[PDB]
Amino acid sequence: VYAWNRKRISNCVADYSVLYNFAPFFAFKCYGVSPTKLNDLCFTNVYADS
Amino acid sequence: ALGKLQDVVNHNAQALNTLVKQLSSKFGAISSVLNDILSRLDPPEAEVQ
Amino acid sequence: PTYGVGHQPYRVVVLSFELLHAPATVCGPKKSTNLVKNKCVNFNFNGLT
């Protein structure tokens, strides 16, 4: 957590449906966007912090 | 000389402009565009926005 | 592993985005349609409806 890994995601088409299809994720909480609307939107500045 | 009549015209257009300007105000919401709010959120929180 | 819930290790991944304030490079699986001119249409350009 002190040295959390940041990966930039850019120049790809993302299928979020597979995230739902296989998911042991006990917590899946979104703040600024709907989970089901992610397939219909375009984004930039995508970062994954692990 | 004709300042009074122009003033009336000046007030009316400005009022419409202010009302038009008010469409660009978030008003404490995530976005000022309704289409973005619909395209981005589920109805329980989109209703709030 | 012997501890109960609340102390077990949890992997957290935070996905961070920005909304419409820049040109977009990551998009959904939706297919692009052809362009039509001089007609009233409901368009979707990069998530802007």
PDB file of C-alpha atoms in Angstrom:
ATOM      1  CA  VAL A   1       0.000   0.000   0.000  1.00  0.00           C
ATOM      2  CA  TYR A   2       2.892   2.442   0.616  1.00  0.00           C
ATOM      3  CA  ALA A   3       4.344   1.618  -2.822  1.00  0.00           C
ATOM      4  CA  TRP A   4       1.089   0.992  -4.734  1.00  0.00           C
ATOM      5  CA  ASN A   5       1.490   0.097  -8.404  1.00  0.00           C
ATOM      6  CA  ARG A   6       0.056   2.478 -11.008  1.00  0.00           C
ATOM      7  CA  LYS A   7      -0.548   1.267 -14.563  1.00  0.00           C
ATOM      8  CA  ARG A   8      -1.773   3.524 -17.360  1.00  0.00           C
ATOM      9  CA  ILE A   9      -4.457   2.079 -19.657  1.00  0.00           C
ATOM     10  CA  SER A  10      -4.766   3.777 -23.047  1.00  0.00           C
ATOM     11  CA  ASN A  11      -5.418   3.100 -26.761  1.00  0.00           C
ATOM     12  CA  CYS A  12      -7.537  -0.011 -26.205  1.00  0.00           C
ATOM     13  CA  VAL A  13     -11.177  -1.057 -26.448  1.00  0.00           C
ATOM     14  CA  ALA A  14     -12.360  -2.440 -23.113  1.00  0.00           C
ATOM     15  CA  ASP A  15     -14.960  -5.174 -22.651  1.00  0.00           C
ATOM     16  CA  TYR A  16     -16.192  -4.829 -19.071  1.00  0.00           C
ATOM     17  CA  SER A  17     -18.708  -7.681 -19.470  1.00  0.00           C
ATOM     18  CA  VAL A  18     -16.025 -10.312 -18.809  1.00  0.00           C
ATOM     19  CA  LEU A  19     -15.208  -8.538 -15.507  1.00  0.00           C
ATOM     20  CA  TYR A  20     -18.803  -9.297 -14.482  1.00  0.00           C
ATOM     21  CA  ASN A  21     -18.797 -12.836 -15.955  1.00  0.00           C
ATOM     22  CA  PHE A  22     -15.900 -14.049 -13.771  1.00  0.00           C
ATOM     23  CA  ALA A  23     -15.604 -12.157 -10.484  1.00  0.00           C
ATOM     24  CA  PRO A  24     -14.600 -13.148  -6.940  1.00  0.00           C
ATOM     25  CA  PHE A  25     -14.745  -9.402  -6.142  1.00  0.00           C
ATOM     26  CA  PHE A  26     -16.608  -9.149  -2.829  1.00  0.00           C
ATOM     27  CA  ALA A  27     -16.596  -5.345  -3.171  1.00  0.00           C
ATOM     28  CA  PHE A  28     -17.326  -3.598  -6.496  1.00  0.00           C
ATOM     29  CA  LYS A  29     -18.108   0.023  -5.627  1.00  0.00           C
ATOM     30  CA  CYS A  30     -18.255   2.835  -8.184  1.00  0.00           C
ATOM     31  CA  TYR A  31     -18.479   6.535  -7.340  1.00  0.00           C
ATOM     32  CA  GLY A  32     -18.685   8.661 -10.484  1.00  0.00           C
ATOM     33  CA  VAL A  33     -20.022   6.217 -13.088  1.00  0.00           C
ATOM     34  CA  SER A  34     -22.562   3.375 -13.385  1.00  0.00           C
ATOM     35  CA  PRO A  35     -21.153  -0.176 -13.585  1.00  0.00           C
ATOM     36  CA  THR A  36     -23.511  -1.147 -16.426  1.00  0.00           C
ATOM     37  CA  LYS A  37     -22.881   1.971 -18.552  1.00  0.00           C
ATOM     38  CA  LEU A  38     -19.119   1.406 -18.937  1.00  0.00           C
ATOM     39  CA  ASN A  39     -19.563  -0.434 -22.255  1.00  0.00           C
ATOM     40  CA  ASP A  40     -21.383   2.554 -23.804  1.00  0.00           C
ATOM     41  CA  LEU A  41     -18.847   5.278 -22.904  1.00  0.00           C
ATOM     42  CA  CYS A  42     -15.420   6.452 -24.049  1.00  0.00           C
ATOM     43  CA  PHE A  43     -12.707   7.350 -21.554  1.00  0.00           C
ATOM     44  CA  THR A  44      -9.184   8.678 -21.177  1.00  0.00           C
ATOM     45  CA  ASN A  45      -6.833   9.086 -18.179  1.00  0.00           C
ATOM     46  CA  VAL A  46      -7.444   5.471 -17.180  1.00  0.00           C
ATOM     47  CA  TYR A  47      -5.268   4.312 -14.306  1.00  0.00           C
ATOM     48  CA  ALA A  48      -5.207   1.089 -12.307  1.00  0.00           C
ATOM     49  CA  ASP A  49      -3.787   1.470  -8.787  1.00  0.00           C
ATOM     50  CA  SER A  50      -3.112  -1.913  -7.172  1.00  0.00           C
TER      51      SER A  50
ATOM     52  CA  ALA B   1     -29.580  61.035 -25.815  1.00  0.00           C
ATOM     53  CA  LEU B   2     -31.435  57.733 -26.309  1.00  0.00           C
ATOM     54  CA  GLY B   3     -29.922  55.996 -23.295  1.00  0.00           C
ATOM     55  CA  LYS B   4     -33.206  55.015 -21.639  1.00  0.00           C
ATOM     56  CA  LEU B   5     -34.644  52.911 -24.492  1.00  0.00           C
ATOM     57  CA  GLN B   6     -31.323  51.215 -25.176  1.00  0.00           C
ATOM     58  CA  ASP B   7     -31.084  50.503 -21.445  1.00  0.00           C
ATOM     59  CA  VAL B   8     -34.361  48.583 -21.618  1.00  0.00           C
ATOM     60  CA  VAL B   9     -33.017  46.596 -24.575  1.00  0.00           C
ATOM     61  CA  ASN B  10     -29.756  46.142 -22.678  1.00  0.00           C
ATOM     62  CA  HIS B  11     -31.545  44.753 -19.655  1.00  0.00           C
ATOM     63  CA  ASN B  12     -33.697  42.288 -21.620  1.00  0.00           C
ATOM     64  CA  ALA B  13     -30.904  40.682 -23.629  1.00  0.00           C
ATOM     65  CA  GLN B  14     -28.705  40.523 -20.539  1.00  0.00           C
ATOM     66  CA  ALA B  15     -31.463  38.769 -18.612  1.00  0.00           C
ATOM     67  CA  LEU B  16     -31.813  36.173 -21.358  1.00  0.00           C
ATOM     68  CA  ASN B  17     -28.038  35.816 -21.493  1.00  0.00           C
ATOM     69  CA  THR B  18     -27.909  35.287 -17.733  1.00  0.00           C
ATOM     70  CA  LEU B  19     -30.629  32.659 -17.988  1.00  0.00           C
ATOM     71  CA  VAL B  20     -28.727  31.065 -20.864  1.00  0.00           C
ATOM     72  CA  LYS B  21     -25.545  31.263 -18.776  1.00  0.00           C
ATOM     73  CA  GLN B  22     -27.359  29.427 -15.983  1.00  0.00           C
ATOM     74  CA  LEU B  23     -27.490  26.304 -18.164  1.00  0.00           C
ATOM     75  CA  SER B  24     -23.696  26.009 -17.723  1.00  0.00           C
ATOM     76  CA  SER B  25     -23.938  25.755 -13.914  1.00  0.00           C
ATOM     77  CA  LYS B  26     -23.379  22.413 -12.187  1.00  0.00           C
ATOM     78  CA  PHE B  27     -25.511  23.519  -9.167  1.00  0.00           C
ATOM     79  CA  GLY B  28     -23.651  21.086  -6.934  1.00  0.00           C
ATOM     80  CA  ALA B  29     -23.907  18.162  -9.362  1.00  0.00           C
ATOM     81  CA  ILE B  30     -21.265  16.106 -11.145  1.00  0.00           C
ATOM     82  CA  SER B  31     -22.002  17.663 -14.550  1.00  0.00           C
ATOM     83  CA  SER B  32     -24.099  20.400 -16.117  1.00  0.00           C
ATOM     84  CA  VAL B  33     -25.102  18.166 -19.052  1.00  0.00           C
ATOM     85  CA  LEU B  34     -28.162  15.981 -18.493  1.00  0.00           C
ATOM     86  CA  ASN B  35     -27.191  13.577 -21.287  1.00  0.00           C
ATOM     87  CA  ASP B  36     -23.871  12.860 -19.546  1.00  0.00           C
ATOM     88  CA  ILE B  37     -25.700  12.198 -16.253  1.00  0.00           C
ATOM     89  CA  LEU B  38     -28.031   9.727 -17.986  1.00  0.00           C
ATOM     90  CA  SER B  39     -25.156   8.119 -19.934  1.00  0.00           C
ATOM     91  CA  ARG B  40     -23.031   7.751 -16.780  1.00  0.00           C
ATOM     92  CA  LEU B  41     -25.174   6.853 -13.761  1.00  0.00           C
ATOM     93  CA  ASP B  42     -27.802   4.393 -12.627  1.00  0.00           C
ATOM     94  CA  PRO B  43     -31.328   5.864 -12.051  1.00  0.00           C
ATOM     95  CA  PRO B  44     -31.096   5.897  -8.184  1.00  0.00           C
ATOM     96  CA  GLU B  45     -28.186   8.383  -8.264  1.00  0.00           C
ATOM     97  CA  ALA B  46     -28.985   9.913 -11.665  1.00  0.00           C
ATOM     98  CA  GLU B  47     -32.339  10.934 -10.162  1.00  0.00           C
ATOM     99  CA  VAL B  48     -30.454  12.826  -7.427  1.00  0.00           C
ATOM    100  CA  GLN B  49     -28.161  14.575  -9.937  1.00  0.00           C
TER     101      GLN B  49
ATOM    102  CA  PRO C   1      -5.073 -17.653   7.266  1.00  0.00           C
ATOM    103  CA  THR C   2      -6.305 -18.606  10.763  1.00  0.00           C
ATOM    104  CA  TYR C   3      -7.757 -15.145  11.451  1.00  0.00           C
ATOM    105  CA  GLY C   4     -11.396 -14.301  10.833  1.00  0.00           C
ATOM    106  CA  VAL C   5     -12.781 -11.719   8.434  1.00  0.00           C
ATOM    107  CA  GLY C   6     -11.747  -8.113   8.970  1.00  0.00           C
ATOM    108  CA  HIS C   7      -8.032  -8.938   9.237  1.00  0.00           C
ATOM    109  CA  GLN C   8      -7.544 -11.157   6.163  1.00  0.00           C
ATOM    110  CA  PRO C   9      -5.530  -9.633   3.278  1.00  0.00           C
ATOM    111  CA  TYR C  10      -7.644  -7.901   0.637  1.00  0.00           C
ATOM    112  CA  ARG C  11      -6.437  -6.944  -2.836  1.00  0.00           C
ATOM    113  CA  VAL C  12      -7.741  -3.523  -3.891  1.00  0.00           C
ATOM    114  CA  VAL C  13      -7.547  -2.164  -7.443  1.00  0.00           C
ATOM    115  CA  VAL C  14      -8.695   1.414  -8.040  1.00  0.00           C
ATOM    116  CA  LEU C  15      -9.727   2.318 -11.581  1.00  0.00           C
ATOM    117  CA  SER C  16      -9.556   6.088 -12.105  1.00  0.00           C
ATOM    118  CA  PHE C  17     -10.986   7.897 -15.139  1.00  0.00           C
ATOM    119  CA  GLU C  18     -11.652  11.452 -16.293  1.00  0.00           C
ATOM    120  CA  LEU C  19     -14.982  12.574 -17.759  1.00  0.00           C
ATOM    121  CA  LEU C  20     -15.019  14.284 -21.195  1.00  0.00           C
ATOM    122  CA  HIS C  21     -12.416  17.001 -20.481  1.00  0.00           C
ATOM    123  CA  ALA C  22      -9.863  15.565 -22.947  1.00  0.00           C
ATOM    124  CA  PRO C  23      -9.720  13.496 -26.162  1.00  0.00           C
ATOM    125  CA  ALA C  24     -10.594   9.903 -25.299  1.00  0.00           C
ATOM    126  CA  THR C  25      -8.539   6.818 -26.174  1.00  0.00           C
ATOM    127  CA  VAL C  26     -10.337   4.005 -24.278  1.00  0.00           C
ATOM    128  CA  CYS C  27     -13.811   3.136 -25.537  1.00  0.00           C
ATOM    129  CA  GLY C  28     -16.468   0.476 -25.167  1.00  0.00           C
ATOM    130  CA  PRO C  29     -17.276  -2.379 -27.538  1.00  0.00           C
ATOM    131  CA  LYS C  30     -20.040  -0.398 -29.323  1.00  0.00           C
ATOM    132  CA  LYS C  31     -19.814  -0.469 -33.113  1.00  0.00           C
ATOM    133  CA  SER C  32     -19.410   2.683 -35.190  1.00  0.00           C
ATOM    134  CA  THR C  33     -22.296   3.596 -37.501  1.00  0.00           C
ATOM    135  CA  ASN C  34     -22.208   5.664 -40.721  1.00  0.00           C
ATOM    136  CA  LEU C  35     -22.629   9.456 -40.780  1.00  0.00           C
ATOM    137  CA  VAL C  36     -25.777  11.156 -42.103  1.00  0.00           C
ATOM    138  CA  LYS C  37     -25.980  14.799 -43.189  1.00  0.00           C
ATOM    139  CA  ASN C  38     -28.732  17.459 -42.937  1.00  0.00           C
ATOM    140  CA  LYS C  39     -31.112  15.333 -40.836  1.00  0.00           C
ATOM    141  CA  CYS C  40     -32.254  15.508 -37.220  1.00  0.00           C
ATOM    142  CA  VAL C  41     -30.460  12.634 -35.465  1.00  0.00           C
ATOM    143  CA  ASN C  42     -29.502  11.584 -31.956  1.00  0.00           C
ATOM    144  CA  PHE C  43     -25.735  11.127 -32.220  1.00  0.00           C
ATOM    145  CA  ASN C  44     -23.131   9.624 -29.888  1.00  0.00           C
ATOM    146  CA  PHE C  45     -19.622  11.044 -30.416  1.00  0.00           C
ATOM    147  CA  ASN C  46     -17.105   9.442 -27.992  1.00  0.00           C
ATOM    148  CA  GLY C  47     -19.709   9.146 -25.248  1.00  0.00           C
ATOM    149  CA  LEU C  48     -21.318  12.542 -25.927  1.00  0.00           C
ATOM    150  CA  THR C  49     -24.995  12.044 -26.791  1.00  0.00           C
TER     151      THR C  49
END
